[PDB]
């Protein structure tokens with residue numbers, strides 16, 4: 643109502659119910675909006691974000707809508723810290739979910755996780771929206787086991803320079819193609835590369851990519867044209883798909899539409 647634009651939520655409409663933990667922007671909570679509707683509430687720690695730029699971008703993000711993409715409901719910006727209000731994902735981050743051996747996943751479930759993410763990424767690609775830090779740690783799982791892509795584009799607004807470039811100690815080296823590590827060339831094809839690494843994370847039940855190497859050693863390995871190798875749970879057909887994401891030449895990597903088609907073909911063949 644009065645005093646709030648379409649991208650703005652009135653924080654007075656929030657009830658806080660459970661803490662979900664802390665990330666590099668600070669705390670995240672589960673709660674209700676206007677008594678009834680489940681939401682997650684990400685509270686942005688002071689000094690961590692380029693806030694005015696993020697708020698303008700939130701307007702764009704409000705217009706993104708896909709069943710496998712975490713939905714932004716709005717932001718609370720009149721106060722500090724500012725809040726990001728989203729759809730609630732009850733089963734938490736995909737990385738931790740994969741590492742819980744009790745799930746005893748079938749490979750058909752792992753392929754479905756890959757398909758969920760691929761659908762979201764195909765949608766983002768159709769909107770010429772880059773994720774810029776796709777990884778299992780960024781994906782979330784809902785109470786139905788569906789995986790959704792989260793934190794899309796958010797790295798653009800992080801002020802901690804340890805996160806923002808390769809020469810940084812917290813940059814996602816292990817999800818980056820050679821042209822990003824060598825020249826900072828981001829594109830649709832760097833999201834493709836990262837998706838391949840994510841498929842490897844899924845099929846490896848959440849192992850760290852290049853687990854015996856440091857980031858510096860990983861960058862060398864990649865630069866010399868070497869790659870991750872096949873997880874035990876991946877069939878040769880699944881491995882072919884993830885490996886196609888790692889062509890040295892960016893232009894030879896598939897699109898998300900093509901990857902989706904390839905994933906559906908394998909599901910059909912492995913059903």
Ligand SMILES: C=CC(=O)N1CCC(CNc2ncnc(N)c2-c2ccc(Oc3ccccc3)cc2)CC1
Pocket residue numbers: 662663664665670682683684712714726727728729730731732734735736737738778779780782792793794796
């Ligand atoms: C391995 C990772 C890890 O330990 N965790 C647990 C803690 C942390 C919980 N966060 C959430 N937990 C449940 N549901 C949610 N919706 C969110 C959530 C809310 C808001 C978000 O912000 C954005 C969303 C989309 C665009 C941009 C911004 C992002 C996520 C993340 C994953």
Ligand SMILES: [Cl-]
Pocket residue numbers: 730731732733783784785786
């Ligand atoms: Cl949920």
